[PDB]
Write a protein that binds this ligand. Structure first.
Ligand SMILES: CCCCCCCC/C=C\CCCCCCCC(=O)O
Length: 131
């Protein structure tokens, strides 16, 4: 886990709109979201991880232990059952609600943090660089 810790800022995004539309997010929120550049902060205290996502539009914060399910309310106001684990060096966050699922996978490549989000047929890639 140690290599993911720190402060990261978004520098590229591909197909976020398709991902948001798949989840049912409405047009007006997709407009603002397409022009937002979040800051993600990942920290650890023993076996507890804290992931903060900050922006001018919305802010989220979750705390969890790897491998242990938790309740989460997402930026889009879904109430989901989540679990985060380490799989081949990637941090894999799975969300489930009403029979559906989406995955948020984080990998380090060349010192950047790549976040891939998949729901349905839509796949979005977002690139973050370390601050
Ligand atoms: C908290 C910052 C979110 C910015 C706009 C999001 C508004 C809601 C729409 C879809 C939410 C999808 C779930 C979270 C995606 C987070 C993306 C990321 O961390 O870059």
């Amino acid at each position: 886990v140690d290599a993911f810790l720190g402060t990261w800022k978004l520098v590229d995004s591909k197909n976020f709109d398709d991902y948001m539309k798949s989840l049912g997010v409405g047009f007006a929120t997709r407009q603002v979201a397409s022009m937002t550049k979040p800051t993600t902060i990942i920290e650890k205290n023993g076996d507890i991880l804290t992931l903060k996502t900050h922006s001018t539009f919305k802010n989220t914060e979750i705390s969890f232990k790897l491998g242990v399910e938790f309740d989460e309310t997402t930026a889009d106001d879904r109430k989901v059952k989540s679990i985060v684990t380490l799989d081949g060096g990637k941090l894999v966050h799975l969300q489930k609600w009403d029979g559906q699922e989406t995955t948020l996978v984080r990998e380090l490549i060349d010192g950047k943090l790549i976040l891939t989000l998949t729901h349905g047929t839509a796949v979005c890639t977002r690139t973050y660089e370390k601050e």
